[PDB]
Swiss-Prot record, chains A, B, C:
Coiled-coil residue spans: 3-46
Family: Belongs to the cyclic nucleotide-gated cation channel (TC 1.A.1.5) family. CNGA3 subfamily.
Tissue expression notes: Prominently expressed in retina.
Disease as annotated in the protein's UniProt record: Achromatopsia 2: An autosomal recessive, ocular stationary disorder due to the absence of functioning cone photoreceptors in the retina. It is characterized by total colorblindness, low visual acuity, photophobia and nystagmus.
Official protein name in the record: Cyclic nucleotide-gated channel alpha-3
Job description of the protein: Pore-forming subunit of the cone cyclic nucleotide-gated channel. Mediates cone photoresponses at bright light converting transient changes in intracellular cGMP levels into electrical signals. In the dark, cGMP levels are high and keep the channel open enabling a steady inward current carried by Na(+) and Ca(2+) ions that leads to membrane depolarization and neurotransmitter release from synaptic terminals.
Subcellular location: Cell membrane
Domain of life where this protein originates: Eukaryota
Domain topic, free-text comment: The C-terminal coiled-coil domain mediates homotrimerization of CNGA subunits.
Quaternary organization: Forms heterotetrameric channels composed of CNGA3 and CNGB3 subunits with 3:1 stoichiometry.
Organism the protein comes from: Homo sapiens (Human)
Length: 46, 46, 46
């Protein structure tokens, strides 16, 4: 019924969010490396 | 009833986190662009 | 029953994600401040 439906909805929503969070964490960690590299380079230059 | 309320609280906590995650994602993507541009302009200036 | 048990599993998963997200958001904000400052120092210096 209504409750079983909402629980199913919540299940699928949480699954989606888990995947999107995993993507963001990984990209954030990856881009952060290159950004720090570029800043460090410029600072050693000036 | 008890279960209905646990499911309510679960839905409301999940909604809050989805909204928070959506904002962080958009901000991350936005600041990545700005910062990369600011870096490019410094790299050329040096 | 199976419904109450799915609800309890979802609650545990969400709580874990909430904590992981709080960790990510906090470090994102902190590193953003620092990156901005570094950029602005570099721009000041040319």
């Amino acid at each position: 019924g209504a409750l079983e439906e909402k629980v199913e909805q919540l299940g699928s929503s949480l699954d989606t969010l888990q995947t999107r969070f995993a993507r963001l964490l990984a990209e954030y960690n990856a881009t952060q490396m290159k950004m720090k590299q570029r800043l460090s380079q410029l600072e050693s230059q000036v």
